[PDB]
Ligand binder design. Sequence first.
Ligand SMILES: CC(C)(COP(=O)(O)OP(=O)(O)OC[C@H]1O[C@@H](n2cnc3c(N)ncnc32)[C@H](O)[C@@H]1OP(=O)(O)O)[C@@H](O)C(=O)NCCC(=O)NCCS
Ligand SMILES: CC(C)(COP(=O)(O)OP(=O)(O)OC[C@H]1O[C@@H](n2cnc3c(N)ncnc32)[C@H](O)[C@@H]1OP(=O)(O)O)[C@@H](O)C(=O)NCCC(=O)NCCS
Ligand SMILES: [Mg+2]
Ligand SMILES: [Mg+2]
Ligand SMILES: [Mg+2]
Ligand SMILES: [Mg+2]
Ligand SMILES: [Mg+2]
Ligand SMILES: [Mg+2]
Lengths: 223, 223
Amino acid sequence: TDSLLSLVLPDRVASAEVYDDPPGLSPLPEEEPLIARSVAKRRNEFVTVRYCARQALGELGVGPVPILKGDKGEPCWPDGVVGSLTHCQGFRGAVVGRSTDVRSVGIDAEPHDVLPNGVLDAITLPIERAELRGLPGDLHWDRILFCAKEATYKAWYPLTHRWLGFEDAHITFEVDGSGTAGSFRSRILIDPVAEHGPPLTALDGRWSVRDGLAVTAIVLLEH
Amino acid sequence: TDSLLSLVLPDRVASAEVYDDPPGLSPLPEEEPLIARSVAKRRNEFVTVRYCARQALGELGVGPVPILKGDKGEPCWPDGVVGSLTHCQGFRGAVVGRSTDVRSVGIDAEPHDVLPNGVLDAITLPIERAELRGLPGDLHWDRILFCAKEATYKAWYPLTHRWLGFEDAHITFEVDGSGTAGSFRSRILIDPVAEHGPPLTALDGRWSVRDGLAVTAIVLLEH
Ligand SMILES: CC(C)(COP(=O)(O)OP(=O)(O)OC[C@H]1O[C@@H](n2cnc3c(N)ncnc32)[C@H](O)[C@@H]1OP(=O)(O)O)[C@@H](O)C(=O)NCCC(=O)NCCS
Ligand SMILES: CC(C)(COP(=O)(O)OP(=O)(O)OC[C@H]1O[C@@H](n2cnc3c(N)ncnc32)[C@H](O)[C@@H]1OP(=O)(O)O)[C@@H](O)C(=O)NCCC(=O)NCCS
Ligand SMILES: [Mg+2]
Ligand SMILES: [Mg+2]
Ligand SMILES: [Mg+2]
Ligand SMILES: [Mg+2]
Ligand SMILES: [Mg+2]
Ligand SMILES: [Mg+2]
């Protein structure tokens, strides 16, 4: 199934997702040092999300490869591929694309639960707090905003190798007729200069709440 | 030479350091994906610091192995080893120890320069700024405190897998008779629970300013 990510992804990318840890999955041998000292719940999400990533790579025509980690934990894709990984309670998902047409991917999944006390204040600009109070529907807008901030960081970081704080992007939401999905824009408030290619002044994505999960995706195209 | 790190390291660890990038050094094949998309100055520090790490491992009786990156970029050491890496303008250094007697290592090097405008206020508790004004010597105490905070994070993170912010530790310095080296204590202000072993309520290290560099080291022993 591509049920949940199909509601946020445009064309030019492949995806895979699961909602549990299939028993007895293994990392590739090359990946073993990344999780040798990890707690079992970290091991599980690492292994299961890379099973999803190798399925998605296969839909691109790319054979199963180790997916290692680099600067600040960013995934290391095979030559000619960009992508993003996510895992939370009840979700693992991977999205990949060819770097010939896709510049960056960021995705994130969150359980559709209220944020813990104090978290909203720590992740919002004043203006975002005002905006969220005006958004329609029985949704955890705090959590959806959090999910979109996380996807924004994952799409930004591989293009800049610079920190992007919660106060460094203003996220604004649009809501479709369903009331359970729509678009967002992340307007960058700091130096937008990329390592390669045009400045990152804004990143556009989609959000969707379904099956107890918020998902967000940003797919920035190569021009 | 072990010149600069010899002024901050206790027993039970091996180290290696250089002040430039020896030309023609290569990553090991397994490390290539971590720097395949990096800018040249990031490749250089990554490659040279792992040359230092493999020398230091050799001093421990450990053969040359890839040093990959895991959660939040932490280095991935061979079974039975802990350690820390640092690189800045004019310095690469690696410190390793056996996990049977060493629990964690965090090291950091900084150019001995004033911090850029605004950085001191972003990295200090109000009380720290007042204490730094009290410390003696023609030293960049702002930079030395920054260097010690970075070492604190590197020692902390592999034991907790939790964020530690600048405001989450109070560092206090003592100054030796030389006026150019001494001890510091990092008092943890958040939940100190470790994943394994006793709580991290405080981390003790040494600092040394020499040859235009600040170096810090924390070596937490296994009991
Ligand atoms: C990196 C971060 C965003 C991940 O958020 P999260 O909700 O825990 O995300 P998930 O657990 O669903 O996904 C983590 C995956 O993201 C990817 N990722 C991690 N660091 C990354 C980075 N620097 N760049 C790109 N992708 C990264 C990894 O593939 C990771 O999974 P893996 O370790 O199994 O390979 C978060 O830990 C973080 O550091 N936040 C601070 C920065 C931020 O949010 N800024 C706000 C910007 S507006
Ligand atoms: C990780 C951090 C401390 C590195 O500081 P820095 O001055 O850039 O350090 P250096 O470049 O000298 O050393 C980087 C090395 O530290 C190691 N390191 C990176 N992340 C690490 C982590 N989570 N845990 C342990 N070591 C880590 C790596 O080996 C890295 O080198 P490599 O990428 O070539 O392998 C910094 O980037 C950071 O994230 N700071 C915010 C957290 C913090 O400082 N809190 C204050 C605590 S009181
Ligand atoms: Mg699919
Ligand atoms: Mg996570
Ligand atoms: Mg998430
Ligand atoms: Mg030595
Ligand atoms: Mg650095
Ligand atoms: Mg440093």
